[PDB]
Amino acid sequence: SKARKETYSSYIYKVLKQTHPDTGISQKSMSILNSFVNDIFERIATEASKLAAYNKKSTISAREIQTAVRLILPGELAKHAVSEGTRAVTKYSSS
Amino acid sequence: DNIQGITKPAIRRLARRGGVKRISGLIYEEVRAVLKSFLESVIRDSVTYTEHAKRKTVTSLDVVYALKRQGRTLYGFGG
Amino acid sequence: MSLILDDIILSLTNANERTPPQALKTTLSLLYEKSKQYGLSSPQLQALVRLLCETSIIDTVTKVYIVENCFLPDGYLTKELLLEIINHLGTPTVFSRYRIQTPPVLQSALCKWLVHVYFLFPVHSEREHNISSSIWLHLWQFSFLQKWITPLVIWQATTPVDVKPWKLSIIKRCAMHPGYRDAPGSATLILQRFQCLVGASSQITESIITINCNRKTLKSHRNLKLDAHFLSILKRILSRAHPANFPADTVQNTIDMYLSEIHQLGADDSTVSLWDVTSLEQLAQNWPQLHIPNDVDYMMKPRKVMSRDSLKHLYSSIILIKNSRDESSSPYEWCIWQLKRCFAHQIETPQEVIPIIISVSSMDNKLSSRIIQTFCNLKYLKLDELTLKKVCGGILPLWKPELISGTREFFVKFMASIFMWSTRDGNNCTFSETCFYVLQMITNWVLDDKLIALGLTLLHDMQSLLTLDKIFNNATSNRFSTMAFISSLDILTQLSKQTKSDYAIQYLIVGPDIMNKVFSSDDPLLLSAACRYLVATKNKLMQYPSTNKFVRMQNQYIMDLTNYLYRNKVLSSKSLFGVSPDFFKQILENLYIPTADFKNAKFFTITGIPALSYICIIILRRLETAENTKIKFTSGIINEETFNNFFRVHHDEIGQHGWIKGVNNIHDLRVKILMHLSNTANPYRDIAAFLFTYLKSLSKYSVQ
Amino acid sequence: LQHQMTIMDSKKQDHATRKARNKELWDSLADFLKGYLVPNLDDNDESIDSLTNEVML
Structure with missing residues (x-):
């Protein structure tokens, strides 16, 4: 009767259980994590869109997303993020 | 009426949380005035959002949207 | 309502020494509910506050309680109550x-009430306030009520003048006085309030530091x-008693800022020139003190906005409010002097002066009377025709003279001056243009209940001059003359519709032989006005007897017009427009037609009249395109000889399709075009509407 | 103007000259003493005007 809430809750819970199973999650922490993930995604998407629109680039691709995440995330996390993302994209292309 | 309704022990607790050990008298109504200013600033945009939505109630989504528009992002309330 | 509340106060005043067990309490109990419900207006409070001190039968404990609770004023509570x-x-x-x-505790409770x-x-009228401020200061010395008048004294004294050294000595000495216990606290705020009023006041800060406390x-x-x-x-209570007065939001706000003033203490004919006046709100306070520097250059040469130039046009108006208008007024003389220069071209150029002075002269009809009466001269037209024309369009239709009610005789002489000017000149068409503005002015006279007959008499003299050979003609004339005349007929037509004006009917009825000019002239627009006037006139003149000059000329118009339009029986008639029909015959045989089958029937009909000849063809061509018949009408004029010849030539093709459906011959054709002419919205719908009523054959199909 | 005329009139209330008021001010003080203050003084063992003339000076 209620339109389903679009969240990342199952995947966040799965990530926690993959890390370590002993502890759990509270509802307030769950909302905090959901809001944080949504905000980060919105920031990155807006940055990629703006950057693509600047070079009159009609499309958004891996290069644009990598540049946008380098712009947003500070370099310390950005190095690991771009390394893991490149690994994922290359292995997906291989698959 | 209720501006004085915000009682001075609450401001005392706020000062103790901040970390001070000495309290003057002017800071009481100065805190009252700054709270009134912040409240009016948030409420104006919250009411604008609510009226534009054509709903005649104010919701957590609207207030957090107004806060994010101000720049003081609030987490843990959805949306 | 409030009368019973007066009785309740009077009940405690009428009876004394009775000492009842519960009757006194019940009257006080009734006063508890009545005070809040009805407001305890100022006259009631004055009697009540005097009753508490006069009678000591009621204990001072309940005397404070009623002051705290019952004293909720809705009235004005002027100084008379405060004086009591x-x-x-x-x-x-x-x-x-x-x-x-009086009990000191009751005084303190009373002192607590007016503070709220x-x-x-x-x-205040700033005359008894000095007495009141000194009285309150003198009353402030009482200790039991010092704590409550101290916030009061902060309020009423807001000026450096109210900060008087003798008041400073009294306030300071009380704090310096040992036996108060509250004056040093009370004096500090009063001294601080007096500090912000006068300025630095190094004398007031040395007194505060001597009387300062732990704060x-x-x-x-x-x-x-x-x-x-x-x-x-x-x-x-305040909102209920006086709607749209003392709003609850502002009443709470006004108390709050009075309270905030006390909190701020700890942290902290008189000549005014109109040149420096900028705010209308300040002007409202400056209205008793307004003074206008007499400069002629500015007060007319530069609104909802706020500025000195916002009151620009108002400056020329407020002076007329400050002092009564007169012919010797400088703004009233500047326009005339500027007007005098512009006609003589002594000014640099008259084009920019006109719009500003016209707007000023548009109003102030008594002033505009002076302007128009002196510049309406033949000599003033010789200098320049255009400048007289420009001022005729601004102040003529907006003028209604009531000074002497004898200006009509001046206009007929002056109006003829322009006409005579146009005769020997040889046209310029400036006479007809100047007449139209006068007709607009005439309707203004007509609209006014006064001098209704005076305006109508002026209008009649215009038609006689407008219907002359040189100015109005069917061969050589201007559309200006006809367009001026068609507006006049609408004035009388509108006058017939109005029933609140009981005028002279001979003024409404136009001349007998003057209608022959308008009828004979073949201007299609002019003929439309005549049909409207004739129809509207027949709405009136129904109570008049069968034999009368007014009703005989009206029936003559109806019979003659229908004969000239549709009846086509002028020869059988006895006359047409005052001309014997046999005169028409004599012209006809002299006229030459290449094929004259029915010579007489072609000229006199709706199609044969030159005014409505070609417009008849236009309607027919519209019908042929819509119906899309086999054969179009090649001829350029509709008459009997063309119609039958058109049908006779194509008689073989008539039998199967013929022409537009619904028509069998020319007689049916002449109506069918008129049915369309009556169906559509156009200036000549009025022509067909008039012909419908007085055609008796078609009137049968109408209801009643 | 309508708002001003409700406040009206500050000037007319005072009006309804200073030298004339000075004589009235002296007379107002003169009549106040003989009527109220002098009877309350109850001195000279009986007095209405003689005691009043002393306090005027």
């Missing part, structure tokens, strides 16, 4: 030992505690 309280305030002495002493409702105090109590003394329940009911 001031009389109650005070202490007994050797001189006043015979007078009964100080915002409701009258806007926790001063912080409590800075805050004034007014009962929220007292103010909440007061806001409701």
Whole structure:
């Protein structure tokens, strides 16, 4: 009767259980994590869109997303993020 | 009426949380005035959002949207 | 309502010494509910506040309670009530030992009451306030009520003048006085309030530091505690008694800023030139002190906005409000002097002066009377025709003279001057243009109930001049003359519709032989006005007898017009437009037609009249395109000889399709075009509408 | 103007000259003493005007 809430809750819970199973999650922490993930995604998407629109680039691709995440995330996390993302994209292309 | 309704022990607790050990008298109504200013600033945009939505109630989504528009992002309330 | 509340106060006043067990309490109990419900207006409070001190039968404990609760004023509570309280305030002495002493606690409670409702105090006349301020300062010396008048004294004294050294000495000495326990707290705020009024005041800061305290109590003394329940009911009481006056939001706000002033103490004919006036709100306060520097260059040469130039046009108007208007007024002479220069071209150029002076002269009809009466001269037209034309379009239709009611005789002479000017000149068409504005002015006279006959008499003289050979003609004339005349007929037509004006009917009825000119002239637009006028006239003139000059000329018009339009029986008639029909015959045989089958029938009909000849063809061509018949009408004029020849040539093709459906011959054709001409919305719908009523054959199909 | 005429009139209330008022001010003080203050003084063992003339000076 209620339109389903679009969240990342199952995947966040799965990530926690993959890390370590002993502890759990509270509802307030769950909302905090959901809001944080949504905000980060919105920031990155807006940055990629703006950057693509600047070079009159009609499309958004891996290069644009990598540049946008380098712009947003500070370099310390950005190095690991771009390394893991490149690994994922290359292995997906291989698959 | 209720501006004085915000009682001075609450401001005392706020000062103790901040970390001070000495309290003057002017800071009481100065805190009252700054709270009134912040409240009016948030409420104006919250009411604008609510009226534009054509709903005649104010919701957590609207207030957090107004806060994010101000720049003081609030987490843990959805949306 | 409030009369019973007067009786309740009178009930406690009428009866004394009775000492009842519960009757006194019940009257007080009835006063508890009646005070809040009806407001206890100022005259009631004055009697009540005098009753508490006069009668000591009621204990001072309940005397304070009723002041705290019942005293919720909705009235104006002017100084008369305050003076009575001031009389109650005070202490007994050797001189006043015979007078009964009011309880000090009641005085403190009374002093607590007007502090809550100080915002409701009258806007003073700044004459008894000096007496009141000194009285309150003298009353402030009493200790039991010092704590409550101290916030009051802060309020009414807002000027450096009210900060008087003798007042400073009294306030300071009380704090320096040992036996008060509250003056140093009370004096500090009063001295601080007096400090912000006069300025630096190094003398007032040396007194404060001598009387300073630990200032926790001063912080409590800075805050004034007014009962929220007292103010909440007061806001409701004030709004109910006076709608749209003392709003509850502002009443609470006004108390708050008065309270905030006390909190701020701890942290902290008179000539005014019109040149420096900028704000209309300030002008409202400056209205008793307004003064206009007499400069002629500015007050007419530069609104909802706020500025000095916003009141620009108002400057020329407020002076007429400040002093009565006169012919010797400088703005009234500047326009005439500028007007005098512009005609003589002594000014640099008249084009920019006209719009500003016209707007000024558009109003002030008594002033505009002077302007128009002196510049309406033949000599003033010789200098330039255009400048006289420009001023005729501005002040003529907007003028209604009532000074002497004898200006009609001047216009007929002056109006003929322009006409005579146009005769020997040889046309310019300036006479007809100038007449139209006068006709607009005439309707203004007609609209006014006064001088209705005077305006109509002026209008009649215009038609005689307008219907002359040189100005109006069917061969060589201008559309200006006809367009001026068609507007005049609408004025009389509108005058017939109005029933609130009981005028002379001979004025409405136009001349007998003057209608032959308008009827004979083949201007299609002009003929439309005549049909409208004739139809509207026949609405009236129904109570008149069968034999009368007015009704005989009206029936003559109807018969002649229909004969000239549709009847086509002028020869059988006895006359047409005052001309014997046999005169028409003599012209006809002299005229030559290449094929004259029915010579007489072609000229006199709706299609044969030159005014409605070609427009008849236009309607037919519209019909042929819509119906899309086999054969179009090749001829350029519709008459009997063309119609039958058109049908005779194509008689073989007539039998199968013929022509547009619904028509069998030319007689049916002449109506069918008129049915369309009556169906559509156009200037000549009025022509067909007139012909419908007085055609008796078609009137049968109409209801009743 | 309508708002001003409700406040009206500050000037007319005072009006309804200073030298004339000075004589009235002296007379107002003169009549106040003989009527109220002097009877309350109850001195000279009986007095209405003689005691009043002393306090005027």
